Write a protein that binds this ligand. Structure first.
Ligand SMILES: OC[C@H]1O[C@H](O[C@H]2[C@H](O)[C@@H](O)[C@@H](O)O[C@@H]2CO)[C@H](O)[C@@H](O)[C@@H]1O
Ligand SMILES: OC[C@H]1O[C@H](O[C@H]2[C@H](O)[C@@H](O)[C@@H](O)O[C@@H]2CO)[C@H](O)[C@@H](O)[C@@H]1O
Lengths: 14, 473, 468, 16
């Protein structure tokens, strides 16, 4: 929820 | 490789990157050399992935604690400033950028966390941590909250975990002892427990993070936060009448922030080392240069002696330094990486009720988190090497492929997420299923990632993860 | 070691070594320093053998393509001409002599192949390679031949294999990909197959080598030869009325010679780097210096701005430059050694009939890219990750310091295991490394430093090869 | 060939 929302940022950059 | 005749610079998003680009704009005016400032996310993990391969920024900016590992791995160029230049900055700031008696970066500013508080909600900020529970109870009565800060980055919770005896690596006569780690001692335990009790008692939320805290503080919803100088700008703008004060004590002990020297390193692989030096020495490290960046987001106590004399007269910088004294400069040794990952893991688990304080810190002690990551990672690496092995074995010694296919493939590769991209023809758009597992999160594997194998025979650098939806409740 | 107070110079016998020695007789008149000029066979292979040991020439002459290989081994001393001297030579010639941003030799001259032809036997040399079979039939009838050039050296057949899409290493954004070789594509097959057909149909003989070609041409026995500028001088002497023109096209495509910049590097172990710097700066790279050499065997398009102005006016030099434009400057990377040896093999094999075009070019493919190594390397990566896997699996969930050196694979393929700070670690020697088998019951040694990092040097001193 | 290839590997080994 609140850590899947961080992975989205990582996915977006990578 | 990096482009010859320009400078790319990575600085973190919270810092003064628009001031920096104006300094870059002045450098352009004089020399004609385009200066680009970027702020990629997870900069300090991204930098060694990309630098390792001869790519990335010309100049990287970060606290000196990661530079040790970057220089160890050969990714930073040795800097040589002349005597006259070294007299312009403080001795202790060169110390932080020294690795095996070589200078491996330029010191920019000292940064330490301070207690930031709202003078209208709290005329008298509390002196002790213990006071906070009762304080929250009377501010909840006013539709408000005592304290919010980033709980997802160990740097913020550390001053409190170190207060009563927790330490990274013991310092003994010049050396750090990587065999003596103070994360699971009685002091570390007490501090973390106190922090976990505030949460169990609903004085803080486990979810709270940098931006929720900043927003919440700047909107006058919470009386106190814990942040660095870079944050003061957005407070000035929110017009909250704010003070910056000494961190509260724990069990009568000062909180012990880890102190960072913001530093600028030069990519070992950059073809512009000379431009980098001139930029850093003659443009940035000057009253003119620093004031440009300080006026964007304050840097803390700067390393340039002459400018520091003007900044030293600010109660906020005074307060920065007072917490600096009480804390400890960060080691810059390469184990810092594992350290931080361990404590990040420990704090979060303990916070979210996943493990008790005992269990979390013990894993930080034994370095379990980073060792599991290294297990899953080396399995993927092995598997992707094997895939490459097979592909080569065929393409060399299998029977002759079509007298009419192509010489020009992108080879089997393993991205930073663990997806292994198979050998593909130039032009191909390649689908692979989304990781089943990524950083403690499970994904729907029946959706795909996408990566383009370019018409020239190289993998595109961007990978399309947009379709990977997590699923955990 | 080399002798202090003389200069020994190695240059190829096909070049103007007597002109060079007259420039050496100038230096000696002036400085009192004896300059000897020699021309050992297999110069470009003899140089790293003897140089490796602190021996051989002060100065070395060759096309730039092998200098990458020499600098990578650290056998060439870094040259440091000042600005005023770099403006005397063309920017693109310094490029060829740069390795890791460092200038590793002096440019002398550009050389590229051309079609050279007998104007009495062929007033109109063919525009296209395909014209050549028929042209040989006519000339055979007059007891002569259409074309002879050296089949033993892949440099000479290259322009035809390259004609229609063959390539060495793919250039892409500043950088040569050594993983993407161009030796087994449709274009190369086409070129070589055409060449092999000439031989099958007796329009050429697979034996034919440099001296057989030169001699046949200069006696007026063959209408055409493919050679470079150094060759023009002997033709002058032969009085054969020769033209120098553009190479024939293949499948409508220009032939693409690899272009060489002839260059002078200084041997790293010579106690005479200052004598060699003054020789090459103030005696050789002067009109007076180059002219003496060129009047012995023409250099081609010289690197010196002020003398190239005159030489540019020679039709021959114009034709050299035209072919040069249609080909490509050789990469100078170390893998050039392996590419040339692979193609030499492929061509001769295909030529003698030992292997078809497919087979030969596949093997060169495999050798040139060093595919065996890439495959061994990935195996070793895998295995080293696996050893990391097992170690972590035990050290965690197996029954009950924070401070190791982490599993690493060095550049030779030894996987160093996770070790304790302070450990001196032994691992057996590689079983294989660059074409050579080693006795694996001897050890490499690497120290895990007290501070948790691997020492940067690794002791490979005990890895003896096994040979016979 | 092999007596000489091995002779280059020694240099690499010496450096590494
Ligand atoms: O939280 C672990 C993290 O702490 C430090 O990072 C600081 C940084 O120094 C500050 O300039 C600012 O960016 O906040 C960061 C934490 O969000 C260490 O420098 C860093 O290496 C480490 O991961
Ligand atoms: O044939 C392989 C060979 O090609 C080139 O050598 C040329 C050289 O450039 C010319 O000056 C002339 O001397 O003929 C040589 C071929 O016989 C490359 O220089 C060389 O490295 C490569 O092995």
């Amino acid at each position: 929820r609140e850590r899947a929302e961080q992975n989205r940022i990582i996915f977006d950059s990578v | 490789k990096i482009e010859e005749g320009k400078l790319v610079i990575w600085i973190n998003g919270d810092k003064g990157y628009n001031g920096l680009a104006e300094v870059g704009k002045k450098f352009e005016k004089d020399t004609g050399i385009k200066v680009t400032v970027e702020h990629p996310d997870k900069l300090e993990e991204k930098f060694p992935q990309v630098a390792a391969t001869g790519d990335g920024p010309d100049i990287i900016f970060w606290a000196h604690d990661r530079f040790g590992g970057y220089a160890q791995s050969g990714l930073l160029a040795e800097i040589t400033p002349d005597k006259a230049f070294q007299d312009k900055l403080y001795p202790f700031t060169w110390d932080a950028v020294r690795y095996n008696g070589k200078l491996i970066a330029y010191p920019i500013a000292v940064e330490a966390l301070s207690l930031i508080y709202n003078k209208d909600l709290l005329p008298n900020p509390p002196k002790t941590w213990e006071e906070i529970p009762a304080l929250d109870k009377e501010l909840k009565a006013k539709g408000k909250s005592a304290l919010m800060f980033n709980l997802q980055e160990p740097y913020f919770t550390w001053p409190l975990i170190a207060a009563d005896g927790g330490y990274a690596f013991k310092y003994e006569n010049g050396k750090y002892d990587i065999k003596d780690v103070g994360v699971d001692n009685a002091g570390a335990k007490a501090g973390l427990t106190f922090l976990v009790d505030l949460i169990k008692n609903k004085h803080m939320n486990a979810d709270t993070d940098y931006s929720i805290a900043e927003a919440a503080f700047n909107k006058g919803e919470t009386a106190m936060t814990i942040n660095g100088p870079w944050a003061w700008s957005n407070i000035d703008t929110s017009k909250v009448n704010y003070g910056v004060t000494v961190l509260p004590t724990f069990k009568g002990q000062p909180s012990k922030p880890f102190v960072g020297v913001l530093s600028a390193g030069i990519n070992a692989a950059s073809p512009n080392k000379e431009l980098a030096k001139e930029f850093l020495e003659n443009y940035l490290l000057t009253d003119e240069g620093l004031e440009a960046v300080n006026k964007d987001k304050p840097l803390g106590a700067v390393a340039l002696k002459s400018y520091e004399e003007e900044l030293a007269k600010d109660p906020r910088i005074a307060a920065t330094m007072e917490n600096a004294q009480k804390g400890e400069i960060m080691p810059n040794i390469p184990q810092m990486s594992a350290f931080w990952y361990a404590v990040r893991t420990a704090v979060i688990n303990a916070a979210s009720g996943r493990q008790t304080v005992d269990e979390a810190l013990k894993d930080a002690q034994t370095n379990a988190a980073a060792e599991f990551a290294a297990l899953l990672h080396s399995l993927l690496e092995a598997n992707c090497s094997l895939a490459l092995a097979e592909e080569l074995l065929l393409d060399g010694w299998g029977p002759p492929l079509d007298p009419e296919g192509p010489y020009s493939y992108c080879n089997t590769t393993l991205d930073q997420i663990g997806t292994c991209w198979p050998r593909s023809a130039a032009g191909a758009l390649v689908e692979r299923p989304c990781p089943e597992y990524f950083n403690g999160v499970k994904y729907n594997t029946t959706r795909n990632a996408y990566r383009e194998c370019l018409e020239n025979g190289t993998w595109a650098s961007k990978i399309n993860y947009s379709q990977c939806e997590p699923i955990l409740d």
